[PDB]
Model the fold of this input.
Amino acid sequence: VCAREPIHIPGLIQPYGVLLVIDPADGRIVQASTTAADLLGVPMAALLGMPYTQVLTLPEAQPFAVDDQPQHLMHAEVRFPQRATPPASAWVAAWHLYPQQWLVEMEPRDARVTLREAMPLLRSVERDPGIAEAAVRVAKGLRSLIGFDRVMIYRFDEEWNGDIIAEARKPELEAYLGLHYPASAIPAQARALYLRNRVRQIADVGYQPSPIQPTVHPQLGTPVDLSDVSLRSVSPVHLEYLANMGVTATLVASIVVNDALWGLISCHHYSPHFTNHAMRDVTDAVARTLAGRIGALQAVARARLESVLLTVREKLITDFNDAEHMTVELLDDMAPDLMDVVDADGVAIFHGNDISRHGTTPDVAALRRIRDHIESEHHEALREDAVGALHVDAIGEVFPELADLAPLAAGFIFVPLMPQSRSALLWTRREQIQQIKWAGNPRKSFDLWQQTVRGRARRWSPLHLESARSLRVLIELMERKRFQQDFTLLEASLSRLRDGVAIIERGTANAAHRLLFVNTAFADVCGSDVAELIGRELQTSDAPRANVELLQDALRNGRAAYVTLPLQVSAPVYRQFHLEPLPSPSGVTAHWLLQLR
Amino acid sequence: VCAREPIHIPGLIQPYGVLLVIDPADGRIVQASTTAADLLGVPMAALLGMPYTQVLTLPEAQPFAVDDQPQHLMHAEVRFPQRATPPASAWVAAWHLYPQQWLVEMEPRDARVTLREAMPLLRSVERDPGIAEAAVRVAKGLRSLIGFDRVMIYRFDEEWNGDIIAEARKPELEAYLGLHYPASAIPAQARALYLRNRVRQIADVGYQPSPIQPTVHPQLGTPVDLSDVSLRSVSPVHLEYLANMGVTATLVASIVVNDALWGLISCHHYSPHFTNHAMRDVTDAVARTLAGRIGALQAVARARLESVLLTVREKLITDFNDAEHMTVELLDDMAPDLMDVVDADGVAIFHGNDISRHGTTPDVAALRRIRDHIESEHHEALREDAVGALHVDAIGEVFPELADLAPLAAGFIFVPLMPQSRSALLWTRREQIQQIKWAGNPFDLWQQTVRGRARRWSPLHLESARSLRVLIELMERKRFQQDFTLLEASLSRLRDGVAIIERGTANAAHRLLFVNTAFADVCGSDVAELIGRELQTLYASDAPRANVELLQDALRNGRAAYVTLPLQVSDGAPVYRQFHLEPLPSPSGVTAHWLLQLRD
Ligand SMILES: */C=C/C1=C(C)C(=O)N/C1=C\C1=NC(=C\c2[nH]c(/C=C3\NC(=O)C(C=C)=C3C)c(C)c2CCC(=O)O)/C(CCC(=O)O)=C1C
Ligand SMILES: */C=C/C1=C(C)C(=O)N/C1=C\C1=NC(=C\c2[nH]c(/C=C3\NC(=O)C(C=C)=C3C)c(C)c2CCC(=O)O)/C(CCC(=O)O)=C1C
Done:
């Protein structure tokens, strides 16, 4: 229910500033934060329904009507012409112009050489190499710039769990560096707002919130979507957490990489600390700059991997097409490259009953148990739902029966997906145990935990997975070469027979019934050799109409027939025609087996 | 010789400022620009070998010893304590701290609300869709931020040639937007310096340069590698070019994307214009924000293309495996997706003599001429040197004989690479004529019209092509599979009793590979319960030693034998048939299989 909270419509503001909701039609204040009455000259009752022009004057930029796409005006100087000296501090206002509403949020300008001072840090990360190095540079650098008691770089993992990869802190305190946080700690709804809004600040934990006096819009009958307002009141859940933790102030800048939330810059202050718009802007700069390189390094990295994976993939491809017989020594030369292409610990090549195991892989029968378990009609749902290749990260989770084997086949890639059998490929990564230094929750009591996760292999790279799909052509290549080898066998075997054999291709009624294959035993009985006989119609008068009719009836209706008939010599030669229909998937007779001794 | 100039060690400075080389060992000035003597107070002779501290009055930040990685201090306030009112304008100094040397460059503070003023422009590009929109936004925006007469975004192509993709200029002066420049215009070493040093400016073209008085280091014996120093003197080659062009001032910010020089922000002023420390810093900001967004959009874009090409690729894959017969109507449903996966204008599927041409492709016999031309032993070098698939951008260049056809097959992707025949795939792009609006070396532009070339084959489209090689082997497998199941059914339905014997080795036995029902019945036990059985099992344990020896000798030496022997009977009926074992030919000549015919 907590992971289902609205958070964007609390109907409350952070007291450090004022919020006003203005009807763009008449330019009158429809809703207002309780803090508005004090900053602005006039108390609540009269301030409500009053035009914005009457109570606040701003010289830099003014609001305006928006058509569809909402527009946002940055923080600019705002004055309060309705009171006998109301500036205990300088004030700055930002706008959120919507087609139905205007949202103005104001806060103290504050002050105190910043953007120029940040420049050498930005330049140093941009030229820096490696998420690690940059993350730690940003951590230390931002700790010097904005001055927080804690600056940590929180990286989101694949399942949206966090990890503190970098940290800069006061000499004192206990380092949270290396700590893992669940996905549940930062809900989807919250995460979305960090993308939409780049920098957010909790100025003082346990603030007395300022409610938006007319809770719902007086004419629209809806609450105020504070999704873009920085003054948006935080979840009490999270506030209690921070309070229990001893942290009183918070600055969180979003590390958005390729328009996706890669991670966060988390800043904690164990005393209260409002970070002014100008400073917020600098942290946003460093966040974007950090966000920039990581993506840069991510791009370069990927690029290099693609190239080498391709080189190896193409060798495997050419080497496989080049050899005409799948020898044990061929596969033993193949295996290293075939494991490398998918960065597997071991690979097992299946070819109908036979298994050619290589690298760090389970026993021949254990492998067979895995293939057998996959090929099953119970796990038929998995194979279809699988992209080009079936792959597991923790064998125990998807194949519960197979829960063991995990020390050597913790993860695997299986190709082909079809229960196609005969040829297959099983890539495997052995179990690699993860030591995950978690973090606690319920002010000076703390005991760390350390989950040791067995059964899981190193996660399958999406790039390694496409490298696997890219090698499907070795399976069809194996299969083609196999049938080609088996065919040339039976073709030689039938040609060396004594009992005169020919395969008759059923003409599609239009075309005649013709000779597909004919042996050296059979052609000889006719005289004319095999080459000249392939393609001639079965109709090769003298022959009795009664006998021909029986044979023709079989050809007509796709049935069998045993009939003695004369032939064409180079004695007239009378052999017994044993025409038999060869089975078809359609059930429609497509070919016939003709033999005669 | 020009494309191999040093440029990093000219031994000269831009007169607008002063450069000093300091020995970090005892803080003395070892080398100095001729301009140093005028602003520092003390003339050259005495200024040389003197400690920097005597002429130091820098309060903001000071130099320091470094270990390995050089460090750079930003432009900060510096004063000359040897002269009574030394300047007319404030002076600012930057440091380049190396483990062997310290490089201090100073220049007028100038000034003339800048970094906050730039923030909405950075904001505007960070949100922009597509490179084209961001490039033009940066161009216009930087032209407003600094009053340059010209601001152009120069994009490097695959061959390191440039293209002005964006431009913001004065109402007057002819637009260079759309102009193409050769790779020769910006040499490799020049390009390298734009990567190492992101921002570069020329204050006034045809400046009287300030030489570094002690040309080489007095103790190390090497010249001064400016490389990071903005005051560095640019090539006279390039200066003459700018002068001929009428431009007097420069400002070039590097668009480095994924650690590679993607392009440049070129700024021209037709009058002299020094851009201050605060100034350069803002352009640096916009350059990387622009570089940032370009790479971001590049990433996102690629990501989305990969996903849809995969979906389509997987449909082709499953749809091809699903059908058991390659009908004309199947291929006609396949063709659209099969062309789409590689963004081809037309595709032609070959299957032994037959051709199923689709989309905008040449005539059936013209296609055949292309395949024939590729499959040739003369172009055998091309095929091996290719990656997974053979591909051309301009058919006329690689296959000169095929120079025509270019209107419909200007470019193509051929697969399989092997002269494997029987099954193939020919993707084709028709000729798309390029109008390249070149630039004229010293007002006069040209317009190359390049015919014979198709749109360049995307590396992403090429890997999408390689990814579909499995359709060729799938076609072929299904074909041999069909031909095999034919002969396998034909032999199984025979009367004379036949079995195929697979020869073994030292540890391996001679086993039955294939056995028909006629053969199985004579033994009693069915076909399933016979495949893989050892040949020895079939004859009785009673069998005469004389007869078995003959058969074994054939198996031993891969020869033939015709011997009557009893059969292993479960019941007890003495079944004696003639074993007609014959060796089936092998390419090696070494008997690999035998044909076992059983007739009385
Ligand atoms: C209902 C689920 C939640 C549990 C359990 C919990 O502890 N918090 C829950 C909800 C929310 N968390 C929100 C923000 C948030 N959480 C973290 C977590 C950490 N920050 C750290 O620095 C560390 C450890 C060092 C942890 C584990 C962060 C960083 C943030 C962002 C703000 C901040 O702390 O800097 C959140 C959004 C609040 C809001 O704006 O309404 C919710 C709902
Ligand atoms: C030696 C061969 C060269 C020929 C021919 C030529 O035209 N230039 C040659 C050499 C160098 N060019 C260098 C720098 C440089 N080149 C450009 C290119 C252009 N600028 C433009 O505005 C346009 C078109 C509108 C083009 C094609 C620029 C911009 C620059 C940097 C200076 C500037 O901002 O104008 C160069 C390096 C010189 C240096 O810095 O030492 C060399 C050797």
Summary: Chain A touches chain B through 64 residues (CB under 8 Å). Residues A 2-3, 7, 152, 164, 176, 181, 184-187, 190, 234-235, 237-238, 241, 250, 252, 264, 266, 268, 439 surround biliverdine IX alpha (ligand 1) (CB under 6 Å).
